[PDB]
Design a protein around this ligand. Structure first.
Ligand SMILES: CCCCCCCCCCCCCCCCCC(=O)OC[C@H](COP(=O)([O-])OCC(O)COP(=O)([O-])OC[C@@H](COC(=O)CCCCCCCCCCCCCCCCC)OC(=O)CCCCCCCCCCCCCCCCC)OC(=O)CCCCCCCCCCCCCCCCC
Ligand SMILES: CCCCC/C=C/C/C=C/C/C=C\C/C=C\CCCC(=O)O[C@H](COC(=O)CCCCCCCCCCCCCCCCC)COP(=O)(O)O[C@@H]1[C@H](O)[C@H](O)[C@@H](O)[C@H](O)[C@H]1O
Ligand SMILES: CCCCC/C=C/C/C=C/C/C=C\C/C=C\CCCC(=O)O[C@H](COC(=O)CCCCCCCCCCCCCCCCC)COP(=O)(O)O[C@@H]1[C@H](O)[C@H](O)[C@@H](O)[C@H](O)[C@H]1O
Ligand SMILES: CCCCC/C=C\C/C=C\CCCCCCCC(=O)O[C@H](COC(=O)CCCCCCCCCCCCCCC)COP(=O)([O-])OCC[N+](C)(C)C
Ligand SMILES: CCCCCCCCCCCCCCCCCC(=O)OC[C@H](COP(=O)(O)OCCN)OC(=O)CCCCCCCCCCCCCCCCC
Ligand SMILES: CCCCCCCCCCCCCCCCCC(=O)OC[C@H](COP(=O)(O)OCCN)OC(=O)CCCCCCCCCCCCCCCCC
Ligand SMILES: CCCCCCCCCCCCCCCCCC(=O)OC[C@H](COP(=O)(O)OCCN)OC(=O)CCCCCCCCCCCCCCCCC
Lengths: 183, 108, 86, 89, 76, 318, 171, 469, 86
């Protein structure tokens, strides 16, 4: 039954692997194919954490539209591309080996509130403690997640949906602003 | 072990089996495009994506009574003017040169 | 008039789905012990079905009825632990 | 926060260290937005609120319209030229 | 050939034109304008004449605003 | 354990059969539309056509990606079968967000059309694959938008909730124009020939084509027409049965699956019936039909529905 | 207030209520009986339930530890109502929740054994169903005749019992 | 009343032809004028620095924001009065400076995106509004599609703006991770003591700041400004700077910031010494943009920077606007015209301009002395009021490096005059056609503000005192 | 805004401590916020559980060294199909 325990750390390792196959590929289509693999590893993680609704929204729009968009572009366009050769990309290695260390450790620094700079990092890993889940009987109707998003976009944050209309408006005007050549 | 998950584990096995029987039994062994073709997919995305902005309203339509209504109506009515932009500008129509321009024959 | 050879495929397709769905309803009623399924399950209803499993003893939705609780009902209450979600 | 930080950092270095084509830039930019989402949605879960999910459902849309805009920018760049170069723009 | 007269060169004649020659934009814009225009004119007529609005549903446990008078009963 | 593996066995085996008998049904009915015998027969021996040509189809020649797109097309076409219910609360997996799943898999179904044009490429063949892709996504829009305006009356993403809501009246009879435009958007997802310029490993596209045929028939059947619903049948039972027993649950599951299968079979016959009578489209006509004329009507129907729910009390509660 | 995990691990605690909280007679009724008897334990134990939620309100954060006294008394009086409905109308109560155990426990599907149970309890136990918050000139929904929403299958035993209650004239 | 314009004009531009674009822009210009004239009595709402939070803790309307909100409409009238109006009525001047069909739409969408930052309270209004204006710069850049440099510039600006947008979203997400709220006033001066916030609040700052030209990453913006046509670049150099700088200055999230102080010094160094050996005029002009946008991280370090900021922003916007309009006038008299989109490219090209006309060089002389802080001009008191706040609050080495930066910068401001007052050998004796009347009256008015704003300096200080305190 | 709205539309798991702190800041003159600090410390520990983590680390540190292990009413783990078995 504790085969079913490491499921999150598995998908973390798979995401590491999958980005290694993003940035090291021969064809430009092989990279987007591992990218839709990355979206579906992400959507598995999002179901895994307790968010079943999002995972399917990620399938709808991220291996939905923008996938088809990128596959489409790479079809009807020619793009020269070289290979990941050692003679053109080993010169970047001593900068990558610094920036990996620094950017990861610093991206794990700000979740803490001490002022020691070593107790800040060691609170990112020192969390093996199991949260206790109680049952409260206060909720009466199945206001799931999507109901509350539809209540907050529409009443409390109606202006963000209404500026959002202008952004999608601009996403329609823009490609017709460019790619038409009127008359 | 519920009955949902054998199915989406068992189908890739069915596909792999129908594929391995094919590998067992088979025989083996830039041009320019129009702007309308690229534009259908580029412009498809802001019309697929207002739909998912419309998805949270349709679940919570009872709660936002009389007020989330008008917010959604205004959202759609802001989207319709960009729609009428693209249909006023004849954006998807692809044109060709088959007309002789119908100029009358002028003499001397 | 009507062709029978044209209508026998659709008759087979119709009969396949018919016998399938009949077998399915019998399997669901056999699993639940003679009652139909719950198609739409609230969070409330899920907590309530777990409490019923805790109350009746082992079996799924036996739906027993008593004036009080047994003395084992006070002690069998569970809390769910949950991993760190790193 | 591990999966989001890893997608963000590695997608970022996949953006920075290419010299081979233009589309790897686009798709590394898109996976950076994925990596920001993976951190935000878990902070929504662990704090018990939708408001990180509010910013999530907004940034889905902005990543969408971002891709629509930027690929029309690329077709602008390609119309006038002949072939998008290997080394870059 | 049927050419555009203009909305400004006679409105009602233009709507009559667009109903014949472009019914995919007349009967599409006229079915979608019959919604928010009818929502401003047909709702008080109903609330006065057909039936008034419904009572709202409860959302949480309805707490009153009293100060706990002391109850008697079910001691032991 | 055994209780559910026998259940998914019965369902997979029934759907795998029905998709194969459709490949015979289409040949037969188009034979009798044009006054030919067509295939010799249709019986238990009748699968041995579709079996025999499904065997011989694996004997021709083809000229890592070529492996993957038939595979993902067929598994995308096959995973969407759980979420249809066949009776009340009978699903192979029960999930509250079934339409969101069904919609995400109509979104996943486009990829094989992209990756099929890469194999054995030419310049013109690549352009043709682009055209099939763009018509597929173009009608996927109006597919999704009408899914919304159906679940405006439900306000729930569960599917048995839709059909139990539908108990009082089907959604097809108020919203009859919606039935018409869904039927044409449904033969638009697929490449049915009023809508088939861009046609005019192959066994997977062949199977997944008919699987999409009968699966979008299912997607019509639960949300527009009555899913498993035929009539009330409360009075007939009180005369036949005396009490709940396995015979009684058998008889009701039987009549529910009959009422579902008759919807699916009449709609499936109408696909083949609209195949024969009409010639095919210019692609400009296809895109023009999708965007300029049908979709403004779709915005109009979308605005007229909540306003009609607004004029009366009539907002649906979750 | 939270939905479970990736991998949640269930556990219990073999322990005891320590010293000062007395033993109580907890409700051993499953979903169908207390969903059936919900309006009647809501009608009798209104001020005790009100008092418990009020006491939980006034001790903000103290909460759980504060009103042990008083969630003791809502259980006692709810157990009292359901013992009384057992000894009162066990047969027709049982008829109603044997109905309501099918039909997803939808209340919509079981009007027929319901009205029989409501006559029985209003006669012997004199408690009455009310839907509050319902302004007048609005009919309560479990009283109306020819509803739009009818069940799939009327269950057999309540058809028979309702017809015999028609013939006896008690209904 | 932007969106009342945008929704109307987008339907209006959808149906009008390609010849109607000039008169469409003329209509929008007059509309913005009358929105400034008939609706500018909303200053009365505040009287004692009264601030309103509107749309539910989402927008924030105070008087600093009202002034920026008025400034942007004024400069947009000056910009739109360029595309509306012909420079001369010649064949050349019609084929030069042609407005595209969708350009007037994208300006007002950008002003919506720029106004919803200065008025912004929530982080989600911040993020949606930086996205709206970043798209509008992506498309104002690329709308001259048939230009090689403009397409390369839009594609560069795309990826650099994309990286800085994800850096801002990471900082917003991270502040959300350490504190549940999104609004900046959940800080309320007790958090910052007991909470390490310095790294988050700087990364939020540096995310916007690097979008503007903070000087370790200054090389990409100079390239975009030199590559766009000469009329896109006056707009896309003014607008994102002033919009986000008044954001970052309204909400003082980085006080005493050491990273901001270093990058402020590095900006004042590399801008003033980068513009020294440069032969292209838009380059010189964009590093004058860089040093002056680096008298900005300085006030961003301060507390209570609303006299120094606002005075210097309207100083800089008038001066900026005027000198671009001067070289747009100067292209008629030059002998060589290349590159239809970008007609004057070199500062060598405007030689001998005093012998062509003298009063355009009088105008050029007052603006270039206003950049270098010459005391009877309006540009002087801007640096004076920066220095009455830098020294007020303890930044002494910042003050010395500010002075040295101003002196090194004046060396390449005065190169414009050194070129423009010299002997040319081919003087103009009679021009047949004359420049458009209103489009030179606008520059005359923008001069007389610069040369005579010290008249009203004292009224402004008293007004200011009432309405912000 | 969406200040304290939960996943299900209710309140957060830390809404009470935050509302207590906003009571504290509502009645407090600026630069008198040093008395307001303990409500804040309670709120930050509601969010991140830091002091609780350090305390459970020290309890587990004393627990894990001993050879006796556990002499207490133990915590019994069950499999999911056996909530109410006995
Ligand atoms: C209720 C009664 C029923 C509803 C009314 C039924 C008719 C509905 C109008 C039909 C639409 C008009 C039309 O011509 O047909 C389609 C029209 C086609 O026109 P066309 O003939 O093909 O043009 C070709 C010509 O060559 C091109 O000719 P053109 O160059 O002359 O351009 C034609 C014109 C075509 O467009 C129009 O003529 C429509 C203009 C109507 C605008 C106002 C309509 C809304 C009325 C509201 C009433 C409010 C009171 C309600 C009180 C109710 C209380 C219970 O386009 C424009 O000129 C630009 C539009 C200007 C809009 C100005 C809007 C802002 C001011 C008005 C609102 C002020 C509010 C202030 C509050 C804010 C304060 C901060 O389609 C569109 O272009 C889209 C219409 C967009 C409407 C906006
Ligand atoms: C885009 C792609 C997105 C990429 C995402 C991946 C990573 C993202 C993180 C980076 C984000 C961008 C980074 C931007 C620069 C970071 C800004 C930054 O340094 O703030 C530091 C935080 O002091 C650390 O504690 C800094 C220590 C940090 C830990 C160092 C790293 C460990 C490396 C181990 C080797 C301080 O600023 P600050 O001047 O206000 O701080 C001053 C100063 O600290 C005090 O002396 C003053 O008295 C006080 O007034 C205060 O204001
Ligand atoms: C905004 C204006 C200001 C920008 C800078 C701000 C300064 C602060 C406020 C300034 C207040 C401005 C008030 C407007 C001033 C009104 C005003 O003097 O008559 C105008 C200027 O008219 C604008 O040029 C109108 C100015 C632009 C407005 C365009 C739409 C009208 C003077 O032209 P003008 O006589 O030489 O023009 C002559 C004359 O009309 C005839 O001889 C000919 O027909 C013509 O070809 C030309 O030779
Ligand atoms: C009849 C119109 C004909 C068409 C003209 C179209 C547009 C004209 C646009 C601008 C003309 C200049 C008006 C300046 C108003 C400044 C208000 C103000 O000093 O702002 C102060 C605060 O400023 C500041 O912090 C510092 C700003 C520093 C300005 C630096 C340059 C000033 C030097 C020249 C400007 C004054 C020249 C006067 C020329 C007679 C706030 O006060 P307020 O917001 O209540 O003032 C507006 C009330 N109002 C709307 C009724 C007018
Ligand atoms: C009942 C009275 C109201 C009916 C008014 C009907 C007006 C009909 C509009 C019309 O005339 O459309 C045709 C016309 C086409 O223009 P044309 O000359 O043919 O040349 C360009 C072609 N692309 O005009 C067009 O360009 C079409 C532009 C309009 C397209 C509308 C479709 C979008 C969906 C509309 C949803 C409804 C919105 C209603 C507004 C709600 C708020 C009040
Ligand atoms: C590809 C992976 C993307 C995951 C898509 C999630 C599909 C889904 O919607 O799962 C829903 C279902 C339960 O969801 P719910 O509606 O709450 O069920 C109600 C029960 N009455 O969930 C289930 O019943 C089972 C979930 C199936 C998804 C399997 C993903 C497992 C990932 C493991 C990682 C291995 C690498
Ligand atoms: C209530 C107020 C309003 C009153 C009006 C009613 C509106 C509600 C009705 C909405 C339903 C709309 C149905 C779809 C509209 C089709 C539009 C159309 O047929 O014509 C337009 C289009 C050509 O465009 P155009 O250039 O204008 O051509 C002029 C030629 N007359 O034509 C085309 O391009 C293609 C035409 C054929 C379309 C494909 C055919 C599919 C075949 C399926 C037919 C139905 C089969 C049913 C099978 C079961 C029947 C038992």
């Amino acid at each position: 039954m504790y085969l079913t325990y490491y499921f999150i750390e598995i998908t973390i390792f798979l995401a590491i692997l999958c980005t290694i196959f993003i940035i090291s590929a021969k064809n430009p289509m092989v990279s987007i194919l591992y990218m839709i693999a990355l979206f579906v590893i992400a959507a598995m993680y999002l179901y895994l954490i307790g968010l079943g609704i999002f995972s399917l929204l990620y399938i709808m729009i991220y291996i939905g539209a923008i996938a088809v968009l990128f596959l489409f572009i790479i079809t009807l366009l020619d793009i020269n591309s070289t290979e990941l050769s050692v003679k053109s990309n080993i010169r970047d290695l001593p900068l990558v080996l610094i920036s990996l260390i620094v950017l990861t450790i610093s991206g794990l620094m700000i979740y803490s509130n001490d002022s020691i700079l070593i107790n800040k990092l060691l609170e990112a890993f020192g969390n093996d403690y199991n949260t206790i889940i109680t049952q409260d009987w206060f909720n009466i109707e199945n206001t799931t997640l999507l109901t509350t998003i539809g209540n907050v976009l529409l009443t409390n944050n109606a202006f963000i949906l209404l500026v959002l209309a202008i952004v999608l408006l601009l996403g329609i005007i823009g490609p017709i602003s460019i790619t038409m050549k009127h008359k | 072990m519920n009955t949902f998950i054998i199915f989406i584990i068992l189908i890739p096995i069915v596909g792999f089996a129908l594929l391995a029987v094919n590998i067992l039994l088979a025989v083996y062994k830039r041009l320019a495009f129009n702007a309308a073709f690229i534009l259908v997919a580029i412009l498809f995305l802001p019309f697929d994506l207002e739909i998912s902005t419309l998805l949270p309203y349709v679940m919570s339509i009872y709660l936002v009574s009389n007020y989330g209504f008008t917010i959604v109506l205004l959202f759609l009515l802001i989207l319709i003017i960009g729609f009428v932009y693209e249909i006023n500008t004849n954006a998807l129509k692809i044109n060709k040169h088959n007309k002789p321009n119908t100029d009358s024959l002028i003499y001397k | 008039a009507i062709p029978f050879e044209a209508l026998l495929p659709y008759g087979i397709i119709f009969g396949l789905l018919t016998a399938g769905g009949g077998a399915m309803q019998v399997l669901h009623v056999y699993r639940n012990g003679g009652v139909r399924d719950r198609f739409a399950i609230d969070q409330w209803d899920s907590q309530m079905m777990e409490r019923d499993l805790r109350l009746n003893g082992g079996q799924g939705r036996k739906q027993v009825d008593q004036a009080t609780a047994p003395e084992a009902f006070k002690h069998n209450h569970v809390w769910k632990s949950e991993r760190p979600l790193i | 926060m591990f999966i989001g930080t890893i997608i963000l950092v590695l997608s970022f270095l996949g953006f920075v260290f290419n010299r081979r084509n233009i589309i790897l830039a686009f798709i590394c930019l898109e996976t950076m937005l994925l990596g920001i989402n993976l951190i935000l949605l878990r902070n929504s879960v662990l704090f018990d609120d939708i408001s990180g999910s509010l910013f999530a459902i907004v940034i889905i849309i902005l990543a969408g319209v971002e891709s629509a805009i930027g690929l029309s920018l690329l077709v602008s760049y390609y119309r006038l030229r002949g072939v998008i170069n290997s080394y870059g723009i | 050939i049927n050419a555009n007269p203009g909305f400004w060169n006679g409105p009602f004649r233009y709507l009559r034109w667009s109903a014949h020659n472009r019914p995919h934009l007349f009967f599409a814009f006229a079915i979608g304008i019959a919604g928010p225009v009818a929502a401003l004119t047909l709702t008080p007529l109903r609330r006065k004449y057909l039936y008034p609005d419904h009572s709202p549903l409860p959302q949480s446990y309805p707490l009153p605003q009293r100060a706990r008078e002391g109850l008697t009963g079910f001691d032991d | 354990m055994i209780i559910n593996i026998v259940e998914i066995l019965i369902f997979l085996v029934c759907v795998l059969f029905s998709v194969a008998y459709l490949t015979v049904a289409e040949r037969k009915t188009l034979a009798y539309m044009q006054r030919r015998l067509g295939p010799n027969f249709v019986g238990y021996y009748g699968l041995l056509q579709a079996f025999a040509d499904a065997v011989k189809l694996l004997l021709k020649e083809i000229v890592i990606i070529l492996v993957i797109s038939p595979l993902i097309t067929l598994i995308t076409a096959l995973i969407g079968w759980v979420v249809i219910p066949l009776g009340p609360g009978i699903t192979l997996g029960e999930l509250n967000l079934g339409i969101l799943f069904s919609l995400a898999i109509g979104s996943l179904g486009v990829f094989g059309s992209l990756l099929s044009g890469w194999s054995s490429n030419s310049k013109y063949s690549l352009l043709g694959s682009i055209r099939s892709t763009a018509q597929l996504i173009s009608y996927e829009l109006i597919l999704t938008s009408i899914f919304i305006i159906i679940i405006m009356f439900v306000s729930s993403l569960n599917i048995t909730t839709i059909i139990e809501t539908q108990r009082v009246v089907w959604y097809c009879i108020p919203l009859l124009p919606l039935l018409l435009i869904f039927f044409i958007a449904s033969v638009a997802e697929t490449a049915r020939p009023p809508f088939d310029l861009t046609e005019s490993p192959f066994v997977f596209f062949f199977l997944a084509e008919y699987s999409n045929i009968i699966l979008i028939s299912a997607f019509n059947g639960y949300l527009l027409l009555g899913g498993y619903l035929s009539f009330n049948y409360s009075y007939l039972f009180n005369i036949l049965f005396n009490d709940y027993s396995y015979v009684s649950f058998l008889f009701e599951g039987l009549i529910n699956s009959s009422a579902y299968a008759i919807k699916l079979v009449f709609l499936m016959f109408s696909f083949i019936w609209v195949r024969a009578a009409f010639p095919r489209f210019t692609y400009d006509n296809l895109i023009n039909f999708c965007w300029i004329i049908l979709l403004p009507l779709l915005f109009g129907i979308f605005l007229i529905i909540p306003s009609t729910l607004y004029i009366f009390d009539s907002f649906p509660t979750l | 207030p939270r939905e479970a995990a990736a991998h949640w691990v269930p556990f219990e605690d073999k322990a005891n209520m320590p010293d000062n909280v007395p033993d109580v007679v907890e409700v051993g009724a499953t979903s169908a009986p207390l969903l059936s008897a919900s309006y009647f334990i809501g009608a009798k134990c209104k001020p005790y339930n009100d008092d418990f939620m009020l006491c939980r309100e006034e001790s903000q954060g103290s909460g759980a530890i504060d009103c042990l006294k008083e969630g003791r008394r809502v259980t006692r009086c709810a157990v009292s109502v359901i013992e009384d409905i057992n000894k009162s109308c066990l047969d027709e109560f049982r008829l109603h929740w044997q109905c309501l155990e099918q039909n997803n426990h939808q209340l919509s599907g079981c009007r027929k054994a319901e009205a029989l149970l409501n006559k029985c309890v209003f006669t012997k136990l004199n408690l009455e169903k009310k839907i509050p918050g319902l302004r007048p000139d609005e009919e309560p929904v479990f009283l109306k005749k020819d509803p739009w929403i009818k069940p799939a299958v009327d269950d057999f035993k309540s058809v028979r019992a309702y017809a015999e209650a028609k013939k006896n004239g008690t209904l | 009343m932007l969106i009342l314009a945008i929704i109307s004009l987008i339907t209006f531009v959808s149906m009008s032809k390609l010849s109607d674009n000039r008169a469409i822009i003329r209509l929008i210009n007059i509309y913005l004028i009358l929105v400034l004239v008939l609706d500018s009595f909303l200053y009365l709402l505040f009287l004692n620095n009264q601030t309103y939070t509107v749309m539910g803790e989402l927008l924030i309307f105070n008087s600093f924001t009202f002034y920026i909100d008025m400034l942007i409409y004024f400069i947009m009238i000056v910009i739109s009065s360029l595309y509306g109006y012909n420079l001369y009525n010649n064949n050349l001047y019609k084929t030069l400076f042609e407005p595209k069909k969708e350009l007037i739409i994208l300006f007002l969408i950008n002003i919506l995106g720029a106004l919803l930052i200065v008025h912004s309270n929530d982080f989600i209004t911040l993020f949606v509004a930086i996205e709206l204006q970043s798209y509008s710069i992506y498309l104002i850049t690329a709308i001259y599609n048939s230009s090689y440099k403009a397409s390369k510039a839009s594609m560069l600006y795309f990826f650099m703006g994309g990286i800085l947008s994800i850096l801002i979203a990471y900082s917003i997400n991270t502040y959300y991770s350490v504190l549940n709220s999104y609004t900046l006033h959940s800080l309320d001066s007790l958090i910052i003591n007991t909470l390490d916030l310095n790294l988050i609040l700087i990364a939020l700052s540096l995310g916007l700041l690097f979008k503007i030209g903070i000087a370790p990453l200054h090389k990409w913006l100079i390239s975009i400004y030199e590559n766009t046509p000469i009329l896109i670049t006056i707009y896309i150099s003014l607008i994102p700077k002033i919009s986000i700088l008044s954001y970052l200055v309204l909400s003082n999230i980085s006080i005493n910031s050491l990273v901001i102080s270093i990058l402020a010094i590095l900006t004042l160094l590399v801008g003033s010494v980068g513009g020294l050996l440069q032969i292209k005029i838009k380059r010189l002009l964009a590093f004058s943009g860089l040093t002056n946008a680096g008298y900005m991280m300085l006030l961003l370090l301060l507390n209570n920077n609303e006299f120094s900021y606002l005075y210097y922003i309207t100083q800089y916007s008038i001066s900026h606007l005027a000198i671009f309009m001067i070289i747009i006038f100067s292209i008629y008299y030059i002998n060589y015209i290349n590159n239809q989109y970008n007609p004057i490219i070199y500062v060598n090209q405007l030689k001998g301009l005093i012998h062509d006309n003298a009063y355009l060089v009088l105008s050029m002389a007052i603006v270039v002395f206003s950049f270098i802080g010459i005391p009877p001009l309006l540009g002087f008191f801007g640096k004076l009021n920066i220095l009455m706040s830098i020294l007020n609050n303890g930044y002494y080495f910042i003050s010395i490096v500010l002075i040295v930066a101003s002196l090194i910068s004046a060396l390449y401001y005065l190169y414009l005059l050194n070129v423009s007052i010299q002997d040319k050998n081919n003087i103009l004796i009679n021009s047949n056609e004359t420049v458009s009347s209103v489009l030179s009256y606008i520059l005359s008015s923008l001069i007389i503000l610069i040369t005579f704003g010290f008249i009203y300096n004292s009224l402004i200080i008293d007004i200011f005192n009432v309405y912000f305190n | 805004t969406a200040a304290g709205i939960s996943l299900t539309g209710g309140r957060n798991r830390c809404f009470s401590e935050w509302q207590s702190f906003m009571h504290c800041t509502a009645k407090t003159d600026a630069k008198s916020r040093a008395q307001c600090l303990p409500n804040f410390e309670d709120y930050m520990e509601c969010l991140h559980h830091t002091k609780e983590k350090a305390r459970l680390r020290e309890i587990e540190s004393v627990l894990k060294q001993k050879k006796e292990g556990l002499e207490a009413p133990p915590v019994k783990v069950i499999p999911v199909k056996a909530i109410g078995l006995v």
